[PDB]
Structure 1
Amino acid sequence: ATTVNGGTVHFKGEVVNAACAVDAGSVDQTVQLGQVRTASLAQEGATSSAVGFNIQLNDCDTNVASKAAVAFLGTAIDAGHTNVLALQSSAAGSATNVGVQILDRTGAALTLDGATFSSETTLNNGTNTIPFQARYFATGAATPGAANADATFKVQYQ
């Protein structure tokens, strides 16, 4: 009887030519690292506790590819720390001398060039979960502030 305007729906997705497809919950996931004390990042090379995040793969076909690796891309904090993400929230409130390190399943920090892939993980037919960890890395004496960071990843099927 009465018809009114409702609104808009935006659909996001991608068609890939690969052995697996990234889950809808892994393409744009947010990782809450929590707070970290300055006393825990009081020197160069100091690290915080790790926070785990996963990249799920769906509809995997082991006949097409047997192993999958992930390479992360982002802004590095320095020219001597290529495996540490630079913080980026705003222009005023952000921690200095602090970055974010992404660790593959072997526990090694991945360099953020978009070309160095992590350790290959064998795939099974179906749903695959690749484990990663993230932590704060101190390039000096840390100062308080926001510690948000962003990165993109690509998956290599071989």
Structure 2
Amino acid sequence: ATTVNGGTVHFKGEVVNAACAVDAGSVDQTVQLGQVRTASLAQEGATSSAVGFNIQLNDCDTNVASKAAVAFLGTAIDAGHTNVLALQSSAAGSATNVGVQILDRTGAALTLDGATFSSETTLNNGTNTIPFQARYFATGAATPGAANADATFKVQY
């Protein structure tokens, strides 16, 4: 009997012609690095512990393509330290001289130019997972404050 206006719902997605499709929980995600003490990141080039995330693939036809690579794109911190994500947050109250570093499964940072892909990983006829790591890289003295970073990823087959 009684009817009222409920609301609005938006749906998002992408239709791709690649060999594999990215999962809904992997297209857009957020991860927690956690608090990191400044004492560990005292001098330049220091490194803290690494937290782990992953990107999920689905319906990977090995006949079309057998290997998958991922390359990141973001904002570098300085000319020398190209492989560090700068802290993209509010203008006020943001930590400086320290960034987020992305580690490929081989334990080395990936270039942020957008053309350096990860090591080739083989796929299977079904769901697939490619692992990555996120840690803190100190380019100098670490200052207290928040640290939020955003970076996109591109897949090559």
CA distance in 1, matches of 2:83, 2:58: 28
- 1:56-83 CA-partner distances (Å, limit 9, x unpaired): 0011110110000000000000000111
- 1:82-123 CA-partner distances (Å, limit 9, x unpaired): 110000110111111100110011111001111100001000
Offset of residue 46 of structure 1: 0.3
- 1:26-59 CA-partner distances (Å, limit 9, x unpaired): 1111010000011011011001100001000011
CA distance in 2, matches of 1:32, 1:77: 20
Q: Spell out structure 1 runs of 4+ moving beyond 2 A.
A: none
Structure 2 residue matching 1:101: 3-state secondary structure: strand
CA distance in 2, matches of 1:17, 1:114: 20
Q: CA RMSD in A?
A: 0.5
TM-score by length of 1: 0.98
Structure 2 segments unaligned to the other structure (5+ residues): none
Offset of residue 2 of structure 1: 1.1
Structure 2 residue 144 is the aligned partner of structure 1 residue 144 = yes
CA distance in 1, matches of 2:115, 2:19: 19
CA distance in 1, matches of 2:38, 2:95: 10
Offset of residue 20 of structure 1: 0.3
TM-score by length of 2: 0.99
Q: Which has the higher strand share?
A: 2
The percent of aligned pairs where both chains have the same amino acid is 100
Offset of residue 3 of structure 1: 1.0
CA distance in 1, matches of 2:148, 2:37: 15
The match for 2:57 is 57
CA distance in 2, matches of 1:12, 1:67: 27
Structure 2 residue 35 is the aligned partner of structure 1 residue 35 = yes
CA distance in 1, matches of 2:143, 2:105: 30
Structure 2 residue 112 is the aligned partner of structure 1 residue 87 = no
